[PDB]
Amino acid sequence: YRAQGVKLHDKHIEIVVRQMMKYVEVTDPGDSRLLEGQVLEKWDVEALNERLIAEGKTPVAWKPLLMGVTKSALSTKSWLSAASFQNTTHVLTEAAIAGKKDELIGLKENVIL
Amino acid sequence: PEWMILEAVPVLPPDLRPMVQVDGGRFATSDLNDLYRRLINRNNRLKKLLAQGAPEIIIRNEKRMLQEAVDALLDNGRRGAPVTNPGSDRPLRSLTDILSGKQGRFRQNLLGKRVDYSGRSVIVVGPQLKLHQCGLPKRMALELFKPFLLKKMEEKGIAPNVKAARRMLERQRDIKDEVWDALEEVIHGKVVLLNRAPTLHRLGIQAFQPVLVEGQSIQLHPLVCEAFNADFDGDQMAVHVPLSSFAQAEARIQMLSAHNLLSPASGEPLAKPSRDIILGLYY
Amino acid sequence: KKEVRKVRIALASPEKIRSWSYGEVEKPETINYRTLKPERDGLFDERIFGPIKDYECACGKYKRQRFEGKVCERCGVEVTKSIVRRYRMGHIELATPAAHIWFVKDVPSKIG
Amino acid sequence: TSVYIEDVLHEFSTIPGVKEDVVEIILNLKELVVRFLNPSLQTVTLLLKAEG
Amino acid sequence: MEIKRFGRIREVIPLPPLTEIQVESYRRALQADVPPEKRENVGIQAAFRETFPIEEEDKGKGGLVLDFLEYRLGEPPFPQDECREKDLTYQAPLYARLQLIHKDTGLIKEDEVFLGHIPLMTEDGSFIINGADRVIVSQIHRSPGVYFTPDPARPGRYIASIIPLPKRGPWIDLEVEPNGVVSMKVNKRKFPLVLLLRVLGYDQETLARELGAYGELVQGLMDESVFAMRPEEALIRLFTLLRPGDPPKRDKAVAYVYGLIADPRRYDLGEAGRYKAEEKLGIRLSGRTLARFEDGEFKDEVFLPTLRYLFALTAGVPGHEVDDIDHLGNRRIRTVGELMTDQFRVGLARLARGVRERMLMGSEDSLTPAKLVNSRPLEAAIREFFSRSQLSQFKDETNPLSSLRHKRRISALGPGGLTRERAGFDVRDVHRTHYGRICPVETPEGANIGLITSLAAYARVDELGFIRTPYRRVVGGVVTDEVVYMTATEEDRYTIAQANTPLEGNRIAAERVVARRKGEPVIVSPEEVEFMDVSPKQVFSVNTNLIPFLEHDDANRALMGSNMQTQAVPLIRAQAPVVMTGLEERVVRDSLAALYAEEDGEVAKVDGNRIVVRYEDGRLVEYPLRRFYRSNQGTALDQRPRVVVGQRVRKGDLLADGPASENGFLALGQNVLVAIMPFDGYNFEDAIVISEELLKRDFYTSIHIERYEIEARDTKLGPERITRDIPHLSEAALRDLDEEGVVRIGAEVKPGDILVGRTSFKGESEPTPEERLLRSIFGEKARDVKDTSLRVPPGEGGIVVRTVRLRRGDPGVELKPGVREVVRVYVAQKRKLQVGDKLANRHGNKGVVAKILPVEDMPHLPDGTPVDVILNPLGVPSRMNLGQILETHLGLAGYFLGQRYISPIFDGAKEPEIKELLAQAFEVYFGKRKGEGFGVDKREVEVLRRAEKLGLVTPGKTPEEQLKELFLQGKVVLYDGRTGEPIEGPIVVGQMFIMKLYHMVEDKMHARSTGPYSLITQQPLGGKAQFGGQRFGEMEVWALEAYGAAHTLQEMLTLKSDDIEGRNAAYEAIIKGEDVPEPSVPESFRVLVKELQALALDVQTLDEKDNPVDIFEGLASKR
Amino acid sequence: ARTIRIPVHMVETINKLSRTARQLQQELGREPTYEEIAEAMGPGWDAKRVEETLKIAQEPVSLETPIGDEKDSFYGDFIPDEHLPSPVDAATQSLLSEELEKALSKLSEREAMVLKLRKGLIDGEEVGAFFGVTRERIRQIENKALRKLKYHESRTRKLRDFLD
Amino acid sequence: KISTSDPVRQYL
Ligand SMILES: CO[C@H]1/C=C/O[C@@]2(C)Oc3c(C)c(O)c4c(O)c(c(/C=N/N5CCN(C6CCCC6)CC5)c(O)c4c3C2=O)NC(=O)/C(C)=C\C=C\[C@H](C)[C@H](O)[C@@H](C)[C@@H](O)[C@@H](C)[C@H](OC(C)=O)[C@@H]1C
Ligand SMILES: [Mg+2]
Ligand SMILES: [Mg+2]
Ligand SMILES: [Mg+2]
Ligand SMILES: [Mg+2]
Ligand SMILES: [Mg+2]
Ligand SMILES: [Mg+2]
Ligand SMILES: [Mg+2]
Ligand SMILES: [Mg+2]
Ligand SMILES: [Mg+2]
Ligand SMILES: [Mg+2]
Ligand SMILES: [Mg+2]
Ligand SMILES: [Mg+2]
Ligand SMILES: [Mg+2]
Ligand SMILES: [Mg+2]
Ligand SMILES: [Mg+2]
Ligand SMILES: [Mg+2]
Ligand SMILES: [Mg+2]
Ligand SMILES: [Mg+2]
Ligand SMILES: [Mg+2]
Ligand SMILES: [Mg+2]
Ligand SMILES: [Mg+2]
Ligand SMILES: [Mg+2]
Ligand SMILES: [Mg+2]
Ligand SMILES: [Mg+2]
Ligand SMILES: [Mg+2]
Ligand SMILES: [Mg+2]
Ligand SMILES: [Mg+2]
Ligand SMILES: [Mg+2]
Ligand SMILES: [Mg+2]
Ligand SMILES: [Mg+2]
Ligand SMILES: [Mg+2]
Ligand SMILES: [Mg+2]
Ligand SMILES: [Mg+2]
Ligand SMILES: [Mg+2]
Ligand SMILES: [Mg+2]
Ligand SMILES: [Mg+2]
Ligand SMILES: [Mg+2]
Ligand SMILES: [Mg+2]
Ligand SMILES: [Mg+2]
Ligand SMILES: [Mg+2]
Ligand SMILES: [Mg+2]
Ligand SMILES: [Mg+2]
Ligand SMILES: [Mg+2]
Ligand SMILES: [Mg+2]
Ligand SMILES: [Mg+2]
Ligand SMILES: [Mg+2]
Ligand SMILES: [Mg+2]
Ligand SMILES: [Mg+2]
Ligand SMILES: [Mg+2]
Ligand SMILES: [Mg+2]
Ligand SMILES: [Mg+2]
Ligand SMILES: [Mg+2]
Ligand SMILES: [Mg+2]
Ligand SMILES: [Mg+2]
Ligand SMILES: [Mg+2]
Ligand SMILES: [Mg+2]
Ligand SMILES: [Mg+2]
Ligand SMILES: [Mg+2]
Ligand SMILES: [Mg+2]
Ligand SMILES: [Mg+2]
Ligand SMILES: [Mg+2]
Ligand SMILES: [Mg+2]
Ligand SMILES: [Mg+2]
Ligand SMILES: [Mg+2]
Ligand SMILES: [Mg+2]
Ligand SMILES: [Mg+2]
Ligand SMILES: [Mg+2]
Ligand SMILES: [Mg+2]
Ligand SMILES: [Mg+2]
Ligand SMILES: [Mg+2]
Ligand SMILES: [Mg+2]
Ligand SMILES: [Mg+2]
Ligand SMILES: [Mg+2]
Ligand SMILES: [Mg+2]
Ligand SMILES: [Mg+2]
Ligand SMILES: [Mg+2]
Ligand SMILES: [Mg+2]
Ligand SMILES: [Mg+2]
Ligand SMILES: [Mg+2]
Ligand SMILES: [Mg+2]
Ligand SMILES: [Mg+2]
Ligand SMILES: [Mg+2]
Ligand SMILES: [Mg+2]
Ligand SMILES: [Mg+2]
Ligand SMILES: [Mg+2]
Ligand SMILES: [Mg+2]
Ligand SMILES: [Mg+2]
Ligand SMILES: [Mg+2]
Ligand SMILES: [Mg+2]
Ligand SMILES: [Mg+2]
Ligand SMILES: [Mg+2]
Ligand SMILES: [Mg+2]
Ligand SMILES: [Mg+2]
Ligand SMILES: [Mg+2]
Ligand SMILES: [Mg+2]
Ligand SMILES: [Mg+2]
Ligand SMILES: [Mg+2]
Ligand SMILES: [Mg+2]
Ligand SMILES: [Mg+2]
Ligand SMILES: [Mg+2]
Ligand SMILES: [Mg+2]
Ligand SMILES: [Mg+2]
Ligand SMILES: [Mg+2]
Ligand SMILES: [Mg+2]
Ligand SMILES: [Mg+2]
Ligand SMILES: [Mg+2]
Ligand SMILES: [Mg+2]
Ligand SMILES: [Zn+2]
């Protein structure tokens, strides 16, 4: 952009990029088996209460993962959001089998409603 | 997991799979219905085939068709594609095709819907107009704020009641110049939104106070011609109306033009003396 | 009355297939021309999916709002306009089951 | 301010034997400059009929 | 007025008959004007011969021989105008002579069978399919031949391609992948490029040595010797290679197919294919395509040359064998004739298909007429092409020019088989060869760009669709007046130069003078200049050629100017530019605007409806004049007589002017004096300020006509009567409803007045219980009918000028089923200029009127004459069309000098010549000023002061002298008008031509409060009278999302469009001055949940604590 | 075979109709006006009959069909809706019911409710309309209350502007 | 795979 005249504050790109890293990988399990890619803060949730409130330090060892903005969204918490762009068909199938409770946060999912 | 197997097929509502009268007497029905019949007939013929007596080959043969059918309504094309008889080799829209589709449900659920209190006309520069307001064709305002006007007609002598106030305006030649005075009064402090062709950023929609004006064109302020990428060679802008006292509150508080002067991209102003102003101020 | 705070997709129990349903569509009878009315029990029947007129009933024993929540003695029609006719669900009872292609042919066969 | 051709009903008509069209003529009339001498004459109707 | 034209490049040849493409194509297409004796046998006659000899021999009994004699079509069912008054498709009747043979003694000849009513062409070049005049647009694609293109992913070597169109008909490719395989593919799978040569008779030894001695690749050819040692057996072996599990024995059957008849095209034996051959590769042809069936032993003079050139292309320079696809000598243009002839033969096949079945059905010999022919196919086929072909379009008559161009457009998209939607950028770019063959400015500024474009000035489709362009010959340093229409390909073999080259006649004048070999700019010597450009005009299209100083205008905006003309609306007052290019005359003439005199004579009568002229030959003919006709796009087309009574006419002189002609010259918009400065904000980005004065004179005014229509339908509830009876409320509205039912001609109709009345029945099947009581209370006996009456749709109407009613006993008209009767209402309206309108010069400056100023205070010149329009300067630097600023300067001269000029494309006027006329104008301007009695103002001097401090005038000279300088610069002093003070600094002004653009239906500013709703989707929908809601797209959603506009978005998703129960309570609330309610659930949501439910899934909304909640208010619980 | 059921007779009927149209296409060169078809068919065949039969013969259309430039046009968005009270109507029913309800009260709850309930509550019987009191008192109060009601409503013009 | 052939084969 700079090279093209546009002057946009870094902030914005940051917000985006961050979301390309909302997920990581697993190598030392506790609740769900190792090879799984899940939301970074959602693990900071597990590790936090698993070492602080409930004892037995079962360290949840992860590995920072980088995935493309397309994929970052392609797979997320809310299936509602996922039903939209990826495979309306798969997105649901899985969300169903698992009995997914879409907590509405985020504007795309809560708009459909 | 014992539910993935199907033995009870939910059927979609009826008015959602219409049967309608057209022209001459043509009819029109949701493709879903030809698929339902498929299943029903097969399911029935199955029953009667079991009851009549049952030669294995034929029972399976049917069971097979049956299966295929159960696919059809759910999702067509995953395994072969069902067709209405010779006329259109077209995949009868499967329920699936409804949800996803080239232009399906969640999909068009986000492409758009049509607002009830909307309008659109050609735009034209409004040099005297202040950022605050915008020129809106009274003729347009009328349809737009129709109900708001109706009642206001009743609060004044112009009409006895709504239905009256309605017929009073159903024809153009019947409007007393008192009605304009009513509308101009209804619009006192209300404001509307204006949109531009590609809505690219939040300023792609801005709120202003309407100042009713003659004719067809919509008077837009020059300073905001930069937020919306609008030039005057036929660019047309839509216009919407904030109905709730809340929608209006936000609309004029945090969505009106003269309040969002600096861009979200850069702390640089977007309300800058564009072309003609500089040229003047510079010389 | 309470704000909708969470949506959830879950699998359909056959008993729930029937819980949502009304009647069983048992015949391929759309609508018969002479009277553009629903043919027999078929896809459009009024018992299965609902009445096709405002506050009024099919035959007309009860016709206004005073008794808005009751059903007709000789024929079944509880009312508020035909929207009920577009929201209601009917079901077909399959002879020998079959399975959802949505679960059998997704790349990972959820049943395989 | 106004014109009445006897057989013509709308402005977009054409009169036989008349090269010009109603609209061209009503146009030519706008070109016409008259002068009355006193207030008593607010609206004067001028008449003309010619044949062949 | 006088005319002065500046540039001198001797225009050696007149421009060709602009519609020759459309006229001649349909001429050769259908050679019907001439006996079957005449030789041109392409098209119809060709397509006929192509499928006529139907040989049906054995499966039971056969020996069928149906043979074609002569094709004859002659007496039109009805005539042109009748075809437009009545819904009719002007088509000529055709029945050719046919005679079926027999294996038993007897040949029955059933002379005629009229199958297929084929449309005819108007003398202008347009058609008349159904009510509206239509046009067949030409197309482009890979001309059927054979080329060699670089291989896909492997950088290595390139592969061969044999292109045979029709679709059915193989598509070959030759590729060598040396580890052990060669690949030749027809439908898909591969095999060795030799088993075939063996079949034909080429043996390993003779082949390898003569063809590839110079080509070591010969080794891959003699490789699998085991099979190469058995000839005719190779024929069966390849049969075997194909795959079904077929009988080894089939003597010479499949070999035939890739042999003589079908699959390889049955085009012309000598050019439609053999051209692409002898020049590109190989030499001869022994029958159209690789063909023979005489001895069972086939001959292939094509199969070996293709490989011959592959071994050649791969090994050096026999020549440089690389084919640039986009070369026009590769890309062919389909003239109308071909487009119709193809659909005509497709039908012939459909016909011939059904007839074969009837060679078996008819009992004995009397089977000639009905037993073999059924007109159902040909009709449907051809008919489908003129009415549903994505090619045959509505005529573009917003004014003659617009239509004419729409008759000479070349499009990409179409048949679906040729270039479709996918591919683009390589095609879309202006290819090198596009010179004189396609404009580089003409294509549509929009998504579909570069794929649709009209040809150039002297561009002509020769024998087969190859736009040739005229280039004159120059032998040595000598230039000729002789011209060669050269194919795209041949153009590259020569060194060609531009017309701008100083010429003394036949003598080139400068040593180092420009030329361009092959798409490359090259400074060549007078001794190398083989050929020269024919004209500057031939480089572009007609539409473009109309621009004054194209030379000084950015090609980008020049496009705008060219498409703007296409949107020119006919004003009751036409005007030719003060400065013209030179083709205005030829445009009106070649288009069919004005009516010209056939031969010399005198004029008899000059009606307003007819000019009966008397030729000196002793004859006189009456020439009707389309008084006021309805153009497809609603622009007036009237022919206004310009000749007085008893006048000796020269052959080919304008008797009457076309819709938009002043004096036999193209005229649109109207030259208006214009100042070019900024005003308040009235002209800010692209806004235009206009002087009220322009409306005082009926200057920008134009007549429109919308043809409202209503039908009396037959409902099972009772016929919809059309009667003056309008059931519920007033006679006031019935006035203009003079005739019982219809509206009276000449009546001023405003929006909401009844155009026509009609009465249908109230309910679907049953009456109304509640409406039963009301009627009874004030008047039980109440006409139980419904007002369904054609009304004036919001927007506008004028005065009714014509009406048409077709009742029960139809004359010769086509009334659709259910359709009891129809009622047309032609309305006309004067469209005087107003603020909403958009006007734009030929250069591209486009823009809208933002304010109409009182002559009182707009910019006025020293002598009291004021400016009509004030254009903003700013719109000129960014965009790059100085040509407009050049026009305004010549214009100023033409104003005072009272004269119009003609500035050719690039040869036209020059900066010094204009300064010269400006000099002459200063004397008319200021000379009279000297004599009339006065000198210079305080103001005039003041602005001079600020002007010398600027640098526009030589300090020290006298004001009189200074003003001349300043005037020669094109600008003069102007006073405000509002203040009377001057506008510090000279400002230019002058006669700029400006047109007014047609107002589309969208223009009719929509605005909808409440209205209909789709049946399945519950979102707002319009149509006839309710405007239909605007779309709230995602991009717009986000816009609000960004803002804290929560409710405002909710509303947009609920109350405004889908909340069924929402919108209703919404209105009512508003009505009762109630602060609108809080949204119920959207039907989009519910529609979803159930759609979702329709599939196994269960979607249940939940509570605070995971518990139910209810969206479907009370309708889902059971019973 | 069809969505809209058609008994065996109509079927053969349609085959006969078709077959006949075939023999008629044989020579005219004119797709038979429904005159020929009647004739050629037999005993009681007329134009109304044939236009009717071929109208039933047309199978339906896909309510969802690719329309115009089939890019993404599904036929069913263009059909309006009839039972649904477009805003205009909901407003109607409000004032109408509120004012009709105001008049119904200030009146004798006798012959007004009789005709109000007989006409606006069940089905459309002067005699069978009133309880015990015969016809004379029905017409008596019906026409005297109905007119006092209309003529005072003429004064305070509320109803005049025909809600319909 | 494709349904006709299989049954044809099936009873044939
Ligand atoms: C064969 O009939 C149809 C086939 C469709 O199928 C499909 C898939 O195949 C197509 C072709 C094979 C084409 O060759 C084609 C065009 O050549 C074309 C446009 C479209 N041009 N529009 C685009 C919108 N703008 C507008 C300006 C303000 C913004 C919006 C105006 C120009 C277009 O989409 C085309 C198209 C298709 O879509 N046009 C131009 O070249 C042009 C730049 C200007 C011409 C304007 C005339 C006014 C116009 O000709 C008019 C007389 C009608 O003829 C048409 C509308 C016609 O409709 C009927 C009915 O007859 C269709 C072409
Ligand atoms: Mg720069
Ligand atoms: Mg992170
Ligand atoms: Mg712990
Ligand atoms: Mg532990
Ligand atoms: Mg994401
Ligand atoms: Mg995913
Ligand atoms: Mg999937
Ligand atoms: Mg319809
Ligand atoms: Mg079927
Ligand atoms: Mg049994
Ligand atoms: Mg079908
Ligand atoms: Mg699909
Ligand atoms: Mg002010
Ligand atoms: Mg203003
Ligand atoms: Mg007005
Ligand atoms: Mg209105
Ligand atoms: Mg009135
Ligand atoms: Mg007044
Ligand atoms: Mg504009
Ligand atoms: Mg335009
Ligand atoms: Mg727009
Ligand atoms: Mg910022
Ligand atoms: Mg709730
Ligand atoms: Mg169960
Ligand atoms: Mg059911
Ligand atoms: Mg009972
Ligand atoms: Mg009961
Ligand atoms: Mg009973
Ligand atoms: Mg996969
Ligand atoms: Mg008279
Ligand atoms: Mg006097
Ligand atoms: Mg006097
Ligand atoms: Mg006096
Ligand atoms: Mg006075
Ligand atoms: Mg007097
Ligand atoms: Mg007088
Ligand atoms: Mg007289
Ligand atoms: Mg010439
Ligand atoms: Mg010449
Ligand atoms: Mg003859
Ligand atoms: Mg003979
Ligand atoms: Mg002619
Ligand atoms: Mg017509
Ligand atoms: Mg590849
Ligand atoms: Mg092929
Ligand atoms: Mg040799
Ligand atoms: Mg090899
Ligand atoms: Mg040669
Ligand atoms: Mg050959
Ligand atoms: Mg040979
Ligand atoms: Mg065939
Ligand atoms: Mg015979
Ligand atoms: Mg692709
Ligand atoms: Mg270009
Ligand atoms: Mg585009
Ligand atoms: Mg695109
Ligand atoms: Mg040709
Ligand atoms: Mg050249
Ligand atoms: Mg040389
Ligand atoms: Mg021009
Ligand atoms: Mg000349
Ligand atoms: Mg004569
Ligand atoms: Mg003659
Ligand atoms: Mg005439
Ligand atoms: Mg004479
Ligand atoms: Mg003369
Ligand atoms: Mg005048
Ligand atoms: Mg004029
Ligand atoms: Mg009367
Ligand atoms: Mg009604
Ligand atoms: Mg009825
Ligand atoms: Mg009905
Ligand atoms: Mg009567
Ligand atoms: Mg009415
Ligand atoms: Mg309209
Ligand atoms: Mg009018
Ligand atoms: Mg008759
Ligand atoms: Mg007819
Ligand atoms: Mg008729
Ligand atoms: Mg007409
Ligand atoms: Mg207007
Ligand atoms: Mg003058
Ligand atoms: Mg002069
Ligand atoms: Mg001079
Ligand atoms: Mg001098
Ligand atoms: Mg348009
Ligand atoms: Mg409405
Ligand atoms: Mg509307
Ligand atoms: Mg909600
Ligand atoms: Mg659930
Ligand atoms: Mg019978
Ligand atoms: Mg039959
Ligand atoms: Mg007859
Ligand atoms: Mg049938
Ligand atoms: Mg689609
Ligand atoms: Mg009372
Ligand atoms: Mg009382
Ligand atoms: Mg009482
Ligand atoms: Mg009382
Ligand atoms: Mg009662
Ligand atoms: Mg009632
Ligand atoms: Mg009763
Ligand atoms: Mg009774
Ligand atoms: Mg009784
Ligand atoms: Mg009595
Ligand atoms: Mg009152
Ligand atoms: Mg398989
Ligand atoms: Zn009932």
Short mmCIF file of N, CA, C and O and ligand atoms in Angstrom, two decimals, chain B residues 216, chain E residues 795-796 829-832 834 999, ligand 82:
data_model
loop_
_atom_site.label_atom_id
_atom_site.label_comp_id
_atom_site.label_asym_id
_atom_site.label_seq_id
_atom_site.Cartn_x
_atom_site.Cartn_y
_atom_site.Cartn_z
N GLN B 216 -36.98 15.89 -9.60
CA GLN B 216 -36.52 14.52 -9.59
C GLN B 216 -35.17 14.27 -8.85
O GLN B 216 -35.07 13.32 -8.06
N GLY E 795 -44.56 8.54 -12.30
CA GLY E 795 -43.57 8.92 -13.27
C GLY E 795 -44.32 9.82 -14.20
O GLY E 795 -44.77 10.85 -13.71
N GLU E 796 -44.51 9.48 -15.47
CA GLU E 796 -45.26 10.43 -16.29
C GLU E 796 -45.96 9.85 -17.52
O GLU E 796 -45.68 8.76 -18.04
N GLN E 829 -45.15 12.76 -24.96
CA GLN E 829 -44.82 13.82 -24.00
C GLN E 829 -43.59 14.64 -24.40
O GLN E 829 -42.59 14.10 -24.86
N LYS E 830 -43.68 15.94 -24.20
CA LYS E 830 -42.55 16.82 -24.48
C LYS E 830 -41.60 16.77 -23.32
O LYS E 830 -42.01 16.99 -22.18
N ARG E 831 -40.33 16.48 -23.59
CA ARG E 831 -39.29 16.41 -22.55
C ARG E 831 -38.33 17.62 -22.64
O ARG E 831 -37.22 17.53 -23.20
N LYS E 832 -38.78 18.74 -22.07
CA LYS E 832 -37.96 19.95 -22.01
C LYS E 832 -36.83 19.75 -20.98
O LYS E 832 -37.03 19.02 -19.99
N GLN E 834 -34.29 19.89 -17.95
CA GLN E 834 -34.46 20.17 -16.53
C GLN E 834 -33.33 19.59 -15.71
O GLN E 834 -32.68 18.65 -16.14
N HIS E 999 -33.19 9.33 -21.11
CA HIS E 999 -33.50 8.97 -19.72
C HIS E 999 -34.02 7.55 -19.64
O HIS E 999 -35.10 7.27 -20.16
MG MG H 82 -40.07 15.06 -16.73
#
